[PDB]
Amino acid sequence: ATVSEVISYWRGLADTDLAWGWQCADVTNGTTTNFFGVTLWGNAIDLLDSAKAQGLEVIYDAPGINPKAGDLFVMFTYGHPYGHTGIIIADSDGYTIQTIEQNQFQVGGPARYVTRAFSDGDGYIVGWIRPPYSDGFRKLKDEVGTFEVMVPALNVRREPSLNGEIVACYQYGMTGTYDSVYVGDGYIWVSYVGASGMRNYMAVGDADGDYNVNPYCKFYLEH
Hints:
monomer, 223 residues, mainly beta, eight-stranded antiparallel β-sheet, six-stranded antiparallel β-sheet, 3 helices
């Protein structure tokens, strides 16, 4: 993937919803997963550690060390322990950063243009990931399980399809029961009856056939 490709994708979304076609639903792991095939686990604040562990390039903020267009920043947050992330859309002079960021729905909101200082009332920039930029459905099984969300943010839908209506977005660490597993549109899905009373579907990893080959969750089976 190219820098212009990725920035243009995010500019498109900022310029403009419940039919968004990404499953992993934050800016950073959403981008690494969907453009680079590299999935990161953790809260936003954890993603520099997870990126390093997956062999990606990570650079920590320091005097004279400033981010570039295409970099994915991690921010320590004062108001909660989970951190914040976004994509840097222009080279930084070290005093401001131009970004696109996101603003039952626990995370994964609509994208917007932001310009921020390196440290403010909400938190401060810790560092950034530099991605390696270059030049139907079917029931699989009934199963009594619980999931644990391991990615920063994960969309939940009303149908187990790429663009099924989004009804929640779960955060890292969320757990819940499920009663069945589906395959569809390149993903494995778990399914459960939501509090609304209607059935929901959540993609839990990229699929090769019936195999979850890139998991977004951990799975636990009743004993």
